[PDB]
Each structure stands twice: as structure tokens, then as C-alpha cells.
Design a protein around this ligand. Structure first.
Ligand SMILES: CS(=O)(=O)c1ccc(Oc2cc(F)cc(C#N)c2)c2c1[C@H](O)C(F)(F)C2
Lengths: 106, 110
């Protein structure tokens, strides 16, 4: 549960601006190699249209639960995850993601 | 038979900045589904790096043609083989940052 949960932060274009180090012992990536890159680079092809839809829901509602999707692991295979996303607006500034790893690797 | 092919322009990062509407019949997305997203996001995980290094190289090649083959995810979520031929353009009356002109064709890998 907890040791399977990490935070990431995203710009409104879905790029990583920050990621917890915890993503290393779970998916392989180092956070630094993640920034500047679209989350989109990483979804499995079959989840892509669904994530697009959640992103639309996230921008229109302001908070969403993604439902289940797969992320290309660092050293091959795909890890299942579920994410809670929350738009932080100020007076849209960024997207906070709470990411829970459902499964192990492939 | 004429290959399906479409024109696009990108910034040096790879973001679509212009899309020729011939893309509908080539990859099934509308232009505005492409605009503002990086071309790497429609690319196969095994080919993303090569595409990134292609865009990096295209700028060092003195405006000559760079070609690359990669799998592109159609609006159907099918992997299509694309040959993208690209080159820089930089208007020599100015010193504005060069951008990248792409021709994108559905080809056979065989
Ligand atoms: C759609 S959602 O649940 O808010 C969501 C989930 C993961 C999201 O990004 C992530 C975060 C992560 F740890 C792994 C992956 C993957 N694969 C995508 C994003 C979202 C938002 O679109 C976003 F823009 F904040 C980016």
C-alpha cells in the first residue's frame, strides 16, 4: 500500500515537473530522467484513449480517479497503476498525482 | 497508387506546430489532436529514443534531409509504420530559431 504509493507533479501539458524517489524501487525510473517528459510517453497503447478521457474529466471537474492503466517500466514490461489526480489552481498551476501501483512487473 | 503522406512542422523539441489535414487519411487523427503534442507521444516505446535522437540530429545537419522509420499509433490504437523525412528551415533574412519540416508517409516494413 504505502510503499507502493508515490507522488508526482505535472504541468498542464502532462509533463513531469516532480516525482517521488519511491518510483525507483517500483518502476525503475529515476525522477530526474522523468522531468520535461509527457506522461503520455509512458502509457501502454491500449490505455491511451482512456487516459485522454480522464485528463478531459480532470480538467473539466478538477479531480479524477484514472481507473486502471499500465506504465512502460524502465527495463521492459508494464506495471499497472491507478492514479488520483487533482488540479491545483491558484487565485491552473499544476497537477498533483497520487499514484498507486496495483501489480508487480512483466 | 499514391502513398498516404502528410506534412507537419515541429519545434526542435518535437512538438507539432503545424499539421497538414492529409493526416486524417494517413493516421486517422484530426490536425488538432496532433497540434501541441510531441511526436514522441504517438511513437512506439522501442522507437521513441531513435526519434528523439533524430530530431536532435536533424538540426546539426546543415538543413539536409534526415529520414527515420518508426511505429506510429493510429487513431485506432494500431502501430503503423511511418517513414518521416525531415529537414530544418531557417530564413536567412533573420536569426530566428530554426524549425523542422517533416513529410510523414505510411510505408511497409518488409
Ligand atoms: C488522468 S489522471 O489520473 O489525472 C493522470 C494519471 C497519471 C498521470 O501521469 C502519470 C503519472 C505516473 F506516475 C505515471 C504515468 C504513467 N504511465 C502517468 C497524469 C494524469 C493527468 O492527466 C496528468 F496530467 F497529471 C498526468
Amino acid at each position: 500500500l504505502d510503499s507502493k504509493t508515490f507522488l508526482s507533479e505535472h504541468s498542464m501539458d502532462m509533463k513531469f515537473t516532480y516525482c517521488d524517489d519511491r518510483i525507483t524501487e517500483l518502476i525503475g525510473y529515476h525522477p530526474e530522467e522523468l522531468l520535461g517528459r509527457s506522461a503520455y510517453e509512458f502509457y501502454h497503447a491500449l490505455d491511451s484513449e482512456n487516459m485522454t478521457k480522464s485528463h478531459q474529466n480532470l480538467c473539466t471537474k478538477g479531480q479524477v480517479v484514472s481507473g486502471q492503466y499500465r506504465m512502460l517500466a524502465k527495463h521492459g514490461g508494464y506495471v499497472w497503476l491507478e492514479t488520483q489526480g487533482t488540479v491545483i489552481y491558484n487565485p491552473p498551476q499544476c497537477i498533483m498525482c497520487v499514484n498507486y501501483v496495483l501489480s508487480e512487473i512483466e | 497508387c499514391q502513398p498516404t503522406r502528410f506534412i507537419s512542422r515541429h519545434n526542435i523539441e518535437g512538438i507539432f506546430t503545424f499539421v497538414d489535414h492529409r493526416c486524417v487519411a494517413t493516421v486517422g487523427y484530426q490536425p488538432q489532436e496532433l497540434l501541441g503534442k510531441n511526436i514522441v507521444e504517438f511513437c512506439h516505446p522501442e522507437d521513441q529514443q531513435l526519434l528523439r535522437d533524430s530530431f536532435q540530429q536533424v538540426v546539426k545537419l546543415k538543413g539536409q534531409v534526415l529520414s527515420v522509420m518508426f511505429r506510429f499509433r493510429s487513431k485506432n490504437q494500431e502501430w503503423l509504420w511511418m517513414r518521416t523525412s525531415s529537414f530544418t528551415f531557417q530564413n536567412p533574412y533573420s536569426d530566428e530559431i530554426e524549425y523542422i519540416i517533416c513529410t510523414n508517409t505510411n510505408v511497409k516494413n518488409s
